[PDB]
């Protein structure tokens, strides 16, 4: 009973800040059918969903009319978009909130003291069953916020103190390639490493067909992205748009040391590990050459290193008697 905004209604909007939205109920229902969000969340009523950068609100309206959660939250700052949301969704059971998702204090206030939005806490053993987050960070400038949330996954401070929370994330098509890079690929970086360490991802959708050549084929065939044409997004000037599913997983290592090791190793992503150990500290090359008894790891490049090998290197760095203080940074 929530009316989806019409393409003409979006057409009247003047300021988008560079955030590409989608206005196709067909594409949304296909994506939802692929995702099968009712499997993990078998109470439609008990669900409480918080959204970031909702924008036009077509996705929010479709989600509400399909699942009917207990409380749906929209966090937007744009004046024109807020006016449009209030005008179109007046009298609706949906709740409209005016804040800034960029500001850290927003969530802390909203959950801690005024408690307009009270979430629910879950154990870390299994997937959360009450709290869901759906974000849209397709704006080209704001791609750093995605890395900030990725780090917050490990730090267990932003919203993952409630448990492991599934993220439905709209991303610029280039950031999706940066994150979802298998070892050995050209687009592998510390973003890919942290993604692999903290979450498992499945590229749900992507607009441009030619872009798919930038990923790994064996992962593409299993993921089965729901491809749609580029004319389906209202601002057609921007780069293609992708969607990913972000499920946090358990991990056992010291986050600060792992971050330091990965960051100082992937500055040189093509030099063989026979020499790049020296960048970590004084005599690091000698110490790691003495400790490591595997020739294959001694010859592999950091771009080809897997997360298990990085964790092993972190353990050896901890075992180093003369390790420098990472906290100086």
């Amino acid at each position: 009973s929530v009316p989806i905004p019409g393409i003409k209604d979006i057409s009247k909007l003047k300021f988008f800040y560079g955030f590409k939205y989608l206005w196709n109920p067909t594409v949304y229902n296909k994506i939802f059918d692929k995702l099968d969000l009712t499997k993990t969340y078998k109470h439609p009523e008990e669900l409480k969903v918080l959204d970031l950068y909702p924008g036009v609100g077509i996705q929010s309206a479709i989600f509400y009319n399909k699942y009917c959660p207990r409380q749906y939250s929209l966090l937007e700052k744009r004046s024109s978009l807020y006016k449009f949301l209030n005008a179109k969704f007046e009298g609706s059971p949906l709740q409209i909130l005016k804040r800034d998702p960029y500001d850290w204090s927003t969530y802390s206030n909203l959950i801690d003291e005024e408690r307009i939005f009270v979430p629910e806490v879950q154990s870390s053993d299994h997937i959360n069953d009450k709290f869901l987050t759906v974000a849209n960070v397709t704006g080209e400038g704001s791609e750093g916020l995605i890395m900030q949330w990725l780090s917050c996954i490990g730090n267990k401070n932003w919203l993952y103190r409630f448990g492991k929370v599934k993220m439905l994330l709209w991303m610029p098509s280039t950031t999706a390639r940066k994150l979802l890079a298998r070892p050995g690929m050209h687009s592998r970086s510390k973003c890919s490493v942290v993604r692999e360490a903290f979450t498992d991802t499945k590229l749900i959708a992507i607009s441009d067909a030619n872009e798919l050549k930038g990923f790994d084929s064996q992962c593409i065939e299993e993921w089965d992205p729901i491809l749609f044409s580029a004319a389906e997004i209202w601002p057609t000037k921007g780069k293609p748009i992708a969607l990913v599913e972000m499920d946090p997983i358990d991990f056992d290592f010291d986050v600060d040391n792992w971050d330091y090791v990965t960051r100082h190793l992937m500055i040189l992503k093509r030099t063989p590990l026979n020499t790049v150990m020296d960048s970590l500290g004084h005599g690091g090359q000698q110490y790691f050459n003495s400790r490591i008894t595997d020739k294959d790891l001694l010859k592999k490049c950091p771009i080809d290193l897997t997360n298990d090998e990085f964790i092993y290197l972190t353990k050896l760095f901890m075992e180093w008697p003369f390790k420098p203080d990472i906290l100086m940074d």
């Binding site: 960051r263 100082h264 500055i267 020296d278 960048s279 500290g281 004084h282 005599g283 901890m318 075992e319 008697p321 003369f322 100086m328 940074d329």
Partner: protein, 919 residues
């Protein structure tokens, strides 16, 4: 022992001269010791300490720092010798058939000669010296200069070794050699450090390398640091043994070596260049060509006279300065000792983000004030330490020139171009009889030191006579009294002159008195004076005191009156800023603006200066930027409505600079530049000063490109690769450069003539300093030299020089296709394109023009006939008188500069009788 008091005690000039010769002979050795460079003494000290430690058999690391350095040198030497062996192997072979080898020989020729032994000294000292150089401590230094500084130090060693017997080293070569040598040092740098095992918590002993490469991330950009081990950090900090090789520049103790060549002069054992060229090859090439031709002898003489005057420190003023410094709190200029920065109380996090950012800005303001006070305290402490060290000695000051020609001292810490304290702590070494006129000139100097230089000479002397009682009281009690000198415009020079005049008045006969204090003679708005002299504008000449008169007109007072009138009419309408600023506009608040308007200070600089003068009043204390910008707008309106003859010359110079910066050589550009359609501009505005110094403006587009080095790829810019000129910079910088070159030329002529006459001459840009007895002779010399400089038409000579040097140049420009003149250009291009068989381009047109010039310039008579028969793009324009009137395809245009603006009538000789022209 105190040489100054010995000199004053010696009665007769004959034994004074004998004592001077003895003092010179004695201080020769001290000067050599002071200029000594620690590239051999450091090695000898390290060897001696190593041998004594080995003989003893028991030592500790704190005193074994030199032993460790000796070990590092011993381990390094074979590797650098091996590198020299590789250099000789590659260089000796005559064959030049490279087989795709990874070996690099460009640096090899650079570091072949002498780096086999002394080099480890430089690597060790420089790497140790840059300890926390660019906040790499987070210990460590940025690799950016670490390779460069090592390379630069090596180059200086070559230059310093040559004077005792590839002139400019490329940035690429310097970075390469620095990188190679630092890598070699990193290889064999070892130190022993004890650690604790994590598993068993047991102590471990294990050597580790000293210097380690690394990278850091700052806002998403790699940086490439080079760090140092904790044990070395502790040993360096706990010993304070920097042992640097380049001594800090200090005033000399011997007469400076007279300038002979552009590279010989100044310091006795340290090389210097006649121009402060910011490593630009063109300026160095032109200067070397001029020196080889030998047409700057007058410049040499002027510099010699400027540097030949001896100085000494003023003990009486230094005592007061030391007392105030030891008190250590706020004074006239000394900010005082701020022990610790106080953190302002912060509002709670529950407060509004606007309040939080207000608190953050408050903390930023406090931190900025603390840092500024810390820096000023450090500068004052350095200056006071140098003054205390040099007190009682015989100072000297060798001088140098920037690319225009203005004279600066070679010692940047303690000189007479410093602040008021710096000028006050200095007096002339020679003592000259006051004579009949010295008393009057000293009184005038005090009168215009207080800032009352807008009054005639008799009124100034009367003011000094009125305030002689306060002079005596202040000189008797510098502190614990009325502190009258504190109210002066320049308190420290005022205090020194107060001491001087009090000692004079205590004497019965002032004429017999022997004075040392210099006397300041200055001109007002030297830029306006030079523009008036160039344009022959009587209307401005009478305004800025060129024409003889009895009342000294004040341009600052006139513009202050105009600004007051503007603010009055604005306050009548009812502007709040007008009400606030209407009555508080003074001479000083616009002095800098009007003085530097000729200098080319833009709107932002004007606002900064006017706010700087507004702040001490504290009338607008919190923030005066809006008042500053409004007042600058009004002051600019006043200056525009006041000056027109200056502006005509300024506009002509700027527009000619633009046309030069948009020019194309006929011959050099014939070679393909990988662009074809769009040419690159490689010509810079060049002219010769009346003295003979050739000026080459260095403004160019400098682009940083990664250069390949052993350690990493360093992101630097190599100026040796020529680049397109920065047309906007050249256009905005030609007028002030021309005026400052004229100022320097007048300085050097006046200094040469005064030195010939036997005066002691010291100059700070416009102001010229001399003993009180020689002021009249210096004034006569100055007026004569100004007449000699401006007798000829300098702007006309400049235009002639441009047209003679830039004869065979062409300009690019866009013209409408509908023009019938452009139609004939297409007609000629149609034949031209067909003959070559391809499409005609601008490069082809320039090649055709060069071919025509080849036929025209050939001395053979038969060759000239073909040139006239050959018609090209530039051939069409040989008949068009006014190119601007004629001015859609881009077509070639000949380079024709506009004829000089109309020259008014003014006999410059008339200023010879003027007395307020320069005072």
């Amino acid at each position: 022992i105190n040489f100054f008091e010995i000199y004053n005690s010696l009665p007769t000039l004959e034994e004074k001269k004998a004592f001077e010769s003895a003092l010179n002979i004695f201080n020769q050795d001290r000067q050599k010791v002071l200029e000594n460079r620690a590239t051999e003494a450091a090695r000898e000290r390290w060897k001696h300490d190593f041998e004594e430690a080995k003989a003893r058999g028991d030592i500790s690391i704190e005193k074994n720092l030199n032993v460790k350095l000796w070990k590092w040198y011993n381990e390094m030497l074979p590797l650098v010798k091996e590198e020299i062996n590789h250099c000789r192997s590659l260089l000796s072979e005559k064959l030049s058939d490279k087989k795709g080898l990874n070996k690099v020989d460009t640096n090899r020729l650079g570091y072949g000669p002498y780096l086999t032994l002394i080099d480890p000294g430089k690597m060790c000292v420089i790497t140790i010296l840059e300890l926390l150089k660019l906040n790499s401590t987070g210990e460590g230094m940025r690799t950016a200069r670490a390779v460069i500084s090592v390379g630069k130090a090596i180059e200086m060693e070559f230059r310093s070794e040559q004077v005792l017997k590839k002139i400019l080293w490329p940035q690429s070569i310097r970075a390469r050699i620095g990188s190679v040598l630092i890598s070699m040092l990193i290889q064999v740098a070892k130190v022993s450090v004890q650690g604790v095992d994590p598993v068993t918590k047991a102590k471990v002993h294990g050597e580790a390398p000293a210097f380690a490469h690394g990278y850091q991330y700052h806002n998403g950009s790699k940086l490439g640091v080079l760090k140092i081990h904790k044990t070395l950090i502790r040993q360096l900090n706990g010993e304070r043994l920097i042992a640097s090789v380049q001594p800090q520049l200090l005033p000399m103790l011997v007469e400076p070596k007279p300038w002979v060549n552009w590279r010989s002069g100044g310091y006795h054992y340290t090389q210097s260049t006649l121009l402060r060229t910011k490593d630009s090859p063109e300026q160095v090439a032109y200067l070397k060509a001029a020196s080889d031709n030998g047409d700057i002898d007058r410049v040499y003489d002027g510099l010699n006279v400027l540097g030949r005057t001896p100085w000494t420190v003023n003990r009486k003023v230094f005592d007061v300065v030391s007392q105030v410094w030891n008190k250590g709190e706020g004074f006239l200029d000394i900010p005082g000792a701020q022990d610790e920065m106080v953190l302002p109380p912060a509002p709670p996090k529950n407060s509004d983000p606007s309040i939080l950012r207000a608190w953050k800005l408050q903390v930023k303001t406090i931190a900025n004030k603390f840092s500024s006070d810390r820096s000023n305290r450090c500068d004052t402490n350095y200056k006071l330490e140098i003054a205390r060290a040099f007190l009682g000695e015989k100072l000297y000051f060798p001088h140098n020139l920037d690319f225009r020609g203005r004279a600066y001292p070679l010692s940047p810490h303690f000189n007479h171009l410093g602040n008021d304290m710096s000028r006050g702590l200095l007096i002339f070494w020679h003592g000259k009889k006051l004579g009949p006129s010295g008393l009057k000139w000293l009184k005038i100097h005090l009168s215009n030191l207080f800032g009352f230089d807008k009054l005639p000479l008799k009124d100034r002397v009367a003011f000094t006579e009125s305030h002689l009682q306060d002079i005596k009281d202040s000189a008797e009690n510098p502190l614990t009294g009325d502190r009258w000198w504190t109210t002066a415009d320049k308190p420290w020079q005022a205090l020194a002159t107060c001491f001087e005049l009090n000692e004079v008045m205590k004497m019965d006969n002032p004429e017999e008195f022997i004075s040392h204090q210099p006397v300041h003679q200055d001109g007002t708005c030297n830029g306006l004076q030079h523009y008036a002299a160039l344009g022959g504008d009587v209307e401005g000449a009478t305004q800025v005191n060129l024409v003889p008169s009895d009342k000294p007109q004040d341009v600052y007072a006139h513009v202050a009156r105009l600004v007051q009138k503007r603010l009055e009419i604005a306050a009548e309408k009812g502007d709040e800023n007008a009400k606030i600023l209407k009555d508080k506009i003074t001479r000083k608040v616009v002095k800098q603006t009007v003085m530097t308007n000729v200098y080319g200070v833009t709107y932002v600089g004007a606002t900064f200066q006017i706010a700087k003068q507004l702040s001490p009043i504290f009338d607008d204390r919190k923030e005066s930027l809006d008042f500053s910008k409004y007042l600058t707008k009004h002051v600019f309106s006043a200056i525009r409505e006041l000056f027109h003859s200056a502006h005509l010359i300024q506009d002509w110079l700027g527009e000619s600079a633009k046309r030069i910066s948009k020019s194309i050589r006929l011959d050099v550009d014939e070679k393909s530049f990988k662009n074809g359609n769009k040419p690159d501009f490689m010509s810079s505005v060049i002219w010769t000063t009346p003295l003979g110094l050739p000026i080459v403006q260095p403004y160019r587009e400098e682009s940083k490109k990664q250069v390949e080095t052993n350690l990493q790829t360093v992101f630097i810019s190599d100026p040796f690769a020529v680049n397109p000129v920065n047309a906007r910079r050249q256009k905005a910088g030609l007028p002030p450069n021309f005026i400052h070159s004229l100022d320097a030329s007048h300085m050097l002529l006046s200094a040469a003539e005064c030195g010939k006459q036997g005066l002691d001459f010291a100059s700070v840009h416009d102001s010229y300093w001399t003993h009180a007895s020689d002021i009249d002779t210096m004034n006569v010399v100055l007026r004569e030299q100004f007449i000699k400089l401006h007798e000829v038409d300098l702007v006309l000579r400049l235009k002639e020089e441009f047209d003679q040097r830039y004869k065979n140049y062409v300009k690019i420009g866009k013209l409408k296709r509908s023009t019938d003149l452009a139609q004939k250009i297409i007609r000629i291009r149609k034949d031209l394109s067909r003959k070559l068989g391809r499409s005609t381009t601008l490069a082809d047109e320039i090649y055709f023009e060069k071919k025509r010039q080849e036929l025209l310039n050939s001395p053979l008579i038969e060759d000239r006939n073909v040139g006239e028969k050959m018609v090209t793009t530039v051939s069409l324009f040989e008949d068009i008188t006014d190119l601007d009137a004629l001015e859609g395809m881009s077509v070639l245009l000949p380079l024709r500069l506009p004829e000089i603006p109309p020259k008014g009538d003014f006999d410059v000789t008339v200023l010879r009788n003027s007395q307020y022209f320069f005072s």
